[PDB]
Ligand binder design. Structure first.
Ligand SMILES: Nc1ccn([C@H]2C[C@H](O)[C@@H](COP(=O)(O)OP(=O)(O)OP(=O)(O)O)O2)c(=O)n1
Ligand SMILES: [Ca+2]
Length: 269
DNA sequence: AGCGCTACCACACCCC
DNA sequence: GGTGTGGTAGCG
């Protein structure tokens, strides 16, 4: 459908031996995904923010290993984002946030725990998928002004058709809470202008959504995403990779663990 | 040389 | 009111 509008941006763009390493940058997100298809190695698309104060981004294309190599030190490649590809199987993830000054009475730690408890029950009744908070990688990036956290579920042999179906899944189970714009009232939070919003950010389930990487911070601020204090997902200890690299892989929404019995979850609106 | 929508206006009809 | 446009600021 939108494939015709894709190259129309290319048409619109008319008046505008060493060791094996793949490190290709692109100024157009479309050119990035074109190279991935025309490449054999397990490669993925990253988005790096530019000095511009706005959200202008450039797009790196490389493997998870080579990326972490030049990324682990956190001296370079600051303000990076995962490009959750469209139509690509992905994990269940959450962007949770509320303004602290406008929501003092609420306790963040207790809300995230209640949300998981409810999502897990939902995952058992809809799809028969059993998981607990021990399968939820908990990331935090809060400030004094904003309670901010990312959740990435680590379901065993389970994944969603794509992130759009992840949004349909949440809009479905969170419809009772949305009505207050079973006891899901704890998800309601007041924003800056006094409006009533939902603790879950249902606006991160779009095509080619950018999602801030583990140990990355927004180009403006300086707070990077780190493993939350009360996180209870611990990857498998492996002598061939660093534990931080394990969390990095687990944090990647699109890095779905291969399996010969994978159940792909779907949800139509 | 970022990307991809929703939310929110404006106006157009349509019918008791 | 109810519903269908349809174009943009503005958000994530
Ligand atoms: N102008 C923007 C803003 C955000 N995003 C993407 C990247 C983010 O990872 C995601 C969610 O945006 P948030 O505003 O929630 O940013 P974060 O939640 O990652 O940071 P924080 O919540 O700490 O502000 O949407 C984007 O592509 N363009
Ligand atoms: Ca957020």
């Amino acid at each position: 459908n939108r494939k015709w509008e894709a190259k129309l941006k290319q048409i619109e763009e008319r008046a505008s031996e060493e060791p094996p390493s793949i490190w290709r940058l692109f100024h157009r997100q479309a050119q990035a995904f074109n190279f991935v298809k025309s490449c054999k190695e397990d490669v993925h698309v990253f988005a790096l923010e530019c000095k511009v104060g706005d959200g202008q981004r450039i797009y790196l294309v490389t493997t998870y290993a080579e990326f972490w190599f030049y990324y682990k030190s956190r001296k370079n490649l600051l303000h990076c984002y995962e490009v959750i590809p469209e139509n690509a199987v992905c994990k269940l993830y959450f962007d949770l946030e509320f303004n602290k000054p406008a929501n003092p009475g609420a306790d963040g730690k207790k809300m995230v725990a209640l949300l998981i408890e409810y999502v897990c029950k939902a995952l058992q009744e809809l799809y028969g998928v059993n998981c607990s908070a021990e399968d939820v990688l908990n990331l935090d990036s809060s400030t004094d002004e904003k309670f901010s956290r990312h959740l990435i579920f680590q379901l065993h042999d389970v994944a969603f058709k794509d992130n759009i179906h992840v949004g349909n899944f949440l809009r479905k189970i969170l419809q009772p809470a949305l009505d207050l714009l079973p006891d899901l009232s704890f998800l309601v939070v007041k924003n800056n202008m006094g409006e009533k919003h939902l603790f879950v950010d249902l606006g991160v389930y779009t095509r080619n959504r950018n999602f801030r990487l583990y140990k990355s911070s927004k180009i403006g601020k300086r707070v990077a995403l780190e493993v939350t204090e009360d996180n209870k997902f611990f990857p498998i200890q492996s002598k061939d990779v660093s534990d931080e690299y394990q969390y990095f892989l687990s944090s990647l929404v699109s890095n779905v663990r291969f399996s010969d019995t994978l159940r792909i979850l779907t949800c139509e609106p």
